[PDB]
From a paper:
Purines are obtained by the parasite from the host erythrocyte mostly via hypoxanthine, the major purine base salvaged by Plasmodium, through metabolizing adenosine via the sequential action of adenosine deaminase and [name] (PfPNP). PfPNP catalyzes the phosphorylation of inosine and guanosine to ribose-1 phosphate and hypoxanthine or guanine, respectively. Since hypoxanthine synthesized through this purine salvage pathway constitutes a major source of purines for the parasite, PfPNP is essential for parasite survival. Like in previously reported structures, PfPNP forms a homo-hexamer, with three 2-fold symmetrical dimers arranged around a crystallographic three-fold symmetry axis running through the central aperture of the assembly.
To understand the mode of inhibition at the atomic level, we co-crystallized PfPNP with [name] and determined the structure of this complex at 1.85 Å in space group R32, which is isomorphous to the structures of PfPNP bound to quinine and mefloquine reported earlier. The [name] inhibitor (MW = 308.4 Da, 1-carbazol-9-yl-3-cyclopentylamino-propan-2-ol) is composed of one heterocyclic carbazole aromatic group of three fused rings connected to a cyclopentyl-amino five-carbon ring by a propane moiety that comprises a hydroxyl group at position 2. The latter forms a hydrogen bond with Asp206, and several water-mediated contacts with Ser91, Asp206 and the hydroxyl group of Tyr160. Thus, the conserved active site residue Asp206 appears key for the stabilization of MMV00848 in the active site pocket. The fused aromatic rings of the carbazole group of [name] fits snugly in the inosine-binding region where it forms an edge-to-face π-π interactions with the Tyr160 phenyl ring and CH-π interactions with Val181 side chain. Although It does not form direct contacts with [name], the bound phosphate ion plays a key role in stabilizing the complex: it forms hydrogen bonds with Ser91 and Arg88, bifurcated hydrogen bonds with Arg45′ from the other monomer (residues form the monomer partner in the dimer are labeled with a prime) and a water-mediated hydrogen bond with Glu184. A conspicuous difference is observed in the active site loop that joins residues Trp212 to Val222 of the enzyme. While this loop is ordered in the complex with transition state analogs such as ImmH where it folds into helix ɑ8, here it is disordered in the complex with [name].
Author numbering:
A (entry chain A), B (entry chain A), C (entry chain A), D (entry chain A), E (entry chain A), F (entry chain A): 4 to 211, 222 to 245
């Protein structure tokens, strides 16, 4: 069994949908056609989802880059071929990207540590195009407006007042949103030959919805099934 | 209510015992005299422990520095005065520090990112002496052998083969153990005027027990009650 | 007139094809339907290309990141909306990617300086998806096999023996090819809201063709015309 | 003979008191019960002190981290087991820590270079607890009020106006005092398995006494004798 | 033949005058006594100059550090013994150093990347004294007033508004002028045992002539002939 | 009075000769024509030397960059115009530069901290040419063979075995010698508009004489008198 996910390599599907909150797994699994509870250890909850004729895991990775890296490494080193993260984010363009808006991200700022412990900082955190394109196409098909851009992946949710946050810098650099895991997923995926992507819903802004969440989940599930079809 | 711990500032005790696994909270709370379940959100589980006439929270912080920082910031900014982490670690001195051995750590290597987003890297991750001294004294009283030293707090649990891990370097520098949160707790505590400490049990070695865990938990609970007495 | 390109903002087309060698501009312009020589100053040669009913500039940017940044900034700050770089590269996967092979790159390693003088190193050098997708589709249409991957953009062509080159590190990290400008183009484009892309032909390997070049040029010209159609 | 201290390894006592000024050695040695002048080379003056039945060296280390490292390395590599630095410092909390106040420090900011040439910057500069506890206890016994905290060890005494000093940053981070050697002593001690500590008297503030110095010296001498007793 | 300069090692003279613009080579070669056109590839134009009885190449290196490094490495690894750069620069002391003024520089700020890929950043970018002295003496002989100082060699000509430029910092540090190649030439020369120097004419200021250019060219040619005499 | 040198600004001569050891001041002052003892505080000993009709201070600066910076800042901010360091060094080219050989250095590697706390690391540590030329000319006049090159100024005299020393790297980069202060003197001098230089005698090699010292001192004194003549 995987040391922390507590599942076997035989239970790892080619496509895996990852989310941060173990509770969101339970909310996702009930909107699939059926499911099989697999394991629940620490913040890592794993369920096998059945959707549109296809099967793919949904696994929670917990909050933050170092914790999610444990999850992602165990999946990538044991059979996963596609990992899509669905999660929440904050808007770095509050005049254009509002609460409830959905963003499909192709790349990320590596404001973590574990990616730098894996490869030099000059290396890009970048998603797989085919995964990005699949998420965009599933949204168009469901007639759900979405934004596209770069996510700032930061290990600091609560800032202090001594070292200035770089969020305003990255906003001026046209980063779209902020969250805490995407860049780690992307680097690990690139290093391990796993195709990755990310779809995120805005729930706040670091500067001065149920319908949207349902839509984002449908997009994420729709894309997982489309990609899973290729590997079946 | 605190955004992620989902408890109120009135429920925050002066002393808090933190652990990584929500399950370990449940294992700890039943060996106290009594307890009050408070909240469970994401990987953050909070319980009020009653032990030796005193009361103190036990809260899980999840795996990894960025995730535990969310927990620690919410406690430090809302009334906590003492935070002791009890957890697991790997031995960096396998000829001297063996599986099951217990280490009480006074300082830590800042191989994370969030501490660096809070204060310059030259700043030390260091625990409070009185907390360190209390944990040592509780162990002596229970006649439980312990080691003392520096912990390497690393955001990388699974290494890759491109960038060498610094664990051997830090072993040669006489670091005792490795784990993934202590340095983050220490810096946040220093910045926020919260006294911190750490007690850890060895469960592996990155290089070439139930009785010990019970002992470590007794030491941690013993020290929490001693410190809580001062604030009551 | 632009200070170094020596053309006017009115002569800047929405789509620009950039190459390193002023001579390659002359080789490209004669395979278009017609052309208009615009300017030639330093290594910056500018020609207006007419191809498949569309018009777009072809401009040389010279060798190396600091020199090409002068070219790219003048285009991005004066009307350019799409910049595609067509150039040469070295294979970082010599068993899979051979001399003459063509690579369409979505992202790049920022081993330059000017990108870091513009934005923090954690920021990704990433291309525009629509541009990447257009280059891939034009190749499929012409039945020309291509590879896709990350380029290492390095300011050091001739290494010395004191500081080890990171090329082997990035090869192990699954970077596909090496060249000297793509990452600079990508960051400048992201900062300036300009869509960028890159198509490259392998002409060597840092470790132990005319038909292919013609094909790569046809792909690059084909994609420029397709994108130019949108802005006309 | 040691290359720069000009004493023999047989003259090295288990406990050594270090100070910056060779003159302070002469002021310290005359308040002991008796003494033996050993050597004086460059700024390194060594005397054997006899106090409360015990013997321990008092050695000057000069101004600044690179110069004191020569002194500390020669002691640690030739028999020293405990090194206590007694010196002066500036207040980083001028509303709380005033001129003449005494601070016993447990850790330090590594704003030097030599510590970084010895071990990675993430490593903590931290003192030995038993040494820290001994200095605190000797002060309580003599009824001498003291403060405890982190020292900023900076290689820059005279700032210029181009690069901002980090002293205000570290003050906001709750560093207590500033001086120029403690962090270097701590890292060298940790690497060499030597127990270190520091006691400092405030003589200024970087921002907007004889009785206290006598008290601080008594505390330092008192602690040296207590520690020396263990090794005799 | 050299890969990019397209000349043979037999055509490399001991002394080489380098300039950025291929056009400036043509302007320089006609004021010599005679010349021999050698090659023109990319931005690298090479001509053999005959002046005051001596012979030395004049070669263009293009804009920017990464591009000029290709030129400089090919010369230094194939016989060159002295390389003098003559070029343009911006004044960092606008009250003292005005448009048209000439500066002979002995050292440079390494705001590039390739020098750092060759040797650690602490290493100085410094010119050869004898070359510096020769340029100064040739100016005195021609009664041409000149300034002397440090050049900032920056890879960023067009700044953006997110990361502050260090030009004001270096101006306060008494750097005289800014340009984009000198530091790269100096480090490569030091590493390869080639004597280097730089003479520059002010053509702007980053903050709030034909006679001078002719004078600067005469100085540069005068110094090349003097140095070439030693090797003939 | 200057805070640490304990002399007045009126006692500061335009030319100052600095050495590390207070004892070397006493050895130097007796070979001048006459002298005036000024002050002795900590490792800072100041004497007014009379030589060949001129007067100039000789001041000891102690061991190491942070300590000598205190000395150099007090001189540069209070009237000094020329500072020459005479000292010892280790050979980084043991096959060419042997024990007793004398090296006159024009630039230095900034392996310190205080220079970096004053100005960004890309800035060169470089000496004044006129000072360098004067030292070379005084040696030629006395028929004393000398070498010229770059010094590595390192804060680490005693290396440990965890982090590799860069001395071999810098030797391969053609650095001539190693010592511990020159780079700090050069940066401080450049920032403060003080002309600096360095002359050094080899007394060891980090890898696998009285007549020479007398010669080096004569050269240093000879150059001080020549420079002092200009300011009198
Ligand atoms: O809300 C998610 C954060 N979700 C996680 C936080 C803890 C568990 C789930 C996005 N987000 C940020 C991510 C990183 C740093 C700062 C922010 C931020 C600021 C304002 C609004 C949203 C923000
Ligand atoms: O076992 C804990 C790790 N516990 C956490 C891991 C995930 C959840 C709980 C200590 N530990 C390490 C911490 C950091 C990096 C490497 C190691 C390591 C290697 C071997 C043995 C123990 C090790
Ligand atoms: O050939 C292009 C380089 N083209 C430019 C070089 C000068 C003008 C045109 C790709 N390339 C590299 C780019 C960067 C660093 C190293 C290499 C490299 C090594 C071997 C083979 C190809 C290589
Ligand atoms: O006074 C000691 C400094 N003692 C040494 C200085 C030279 C010899 C002895 C503490 N101190 C500082 C140490 C570091 C950097 C700045 C300061 C500082 C500023 C104001 C007041 C005190 C200060
Ligand atoms: O003009 C040369 C630049 N020449 C080159 C530029 C492109 C081809 C030739 C000096 N220069 C700068 C060099 C670096 C960065 C900024 C500046 C700058 C700013 C104002 C005035 C002059 C300046
Ligand atoms: O001897 C002087 C050092 N003098 C000072 C040392 C303490 C007081 C005086 C040159 N030197 C080095 C300077 C820096 C780092 C390493 C070395 C080194 C190694 C071997 C031989 C000479 C060496
Ligand atoms: Na977590
Ligand atoms: Na983390
Ligand atoms: Na160029
Ligand atoms: Na460049
Ligand atoms: Na000193
Ligand atoms: Na120092």
């Amino acid at each position: 069994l995987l040391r922390h996910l507590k599942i076997s390599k035989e239970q790892i599907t080619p496509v895996v949908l990852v989310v941060g909150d173990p509770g969101r797994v339970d909310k996702i699994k009930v909107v699939c056609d059926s499911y099989v509870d697999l394991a629940y250890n620490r913040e890592y909850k794993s369920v096998e989802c059945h959707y549109k004729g296809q099967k793919f895991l949904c696994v929670s990775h917990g909050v933050g880059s170092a914790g999610c890296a444990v999850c992602f490494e165990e999946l990538c080193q044991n059979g996963a071929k596609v990992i899509i993260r669905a999660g929440s984010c904050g808007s770095l363009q509050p005049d254009l990207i509002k609460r409830g808006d959905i963003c499909i991200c192709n790349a990320a700022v590596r404001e973590d540590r574990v990616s730098h412990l894996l490869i030099h900082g000059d290396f890009p955190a970048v998603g797989d195009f085919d995964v990005y394109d699949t998420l965009n196409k599933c949204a168009q098909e469901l007639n759900v407006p979405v934004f596209n851009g770069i996510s700032v992946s930061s290990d600091m949710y609560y800032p202090n007042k001594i070292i200035p946050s770089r969020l305003e810098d990255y906003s001026k650099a046209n980063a779209a949103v902020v969250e805490m895991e995407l860049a780690t997923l992307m680097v690990i995926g690139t290093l391990r030959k796993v195709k990755t992507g990310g779809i995120l819903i805005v729930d706040g802004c670091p500067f001065k919805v149920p319908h949207q969440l349902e839509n984002m989940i449908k997009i994420a599930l729709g894309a997982c099934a489309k990609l899973a079809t290729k590997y079946a």
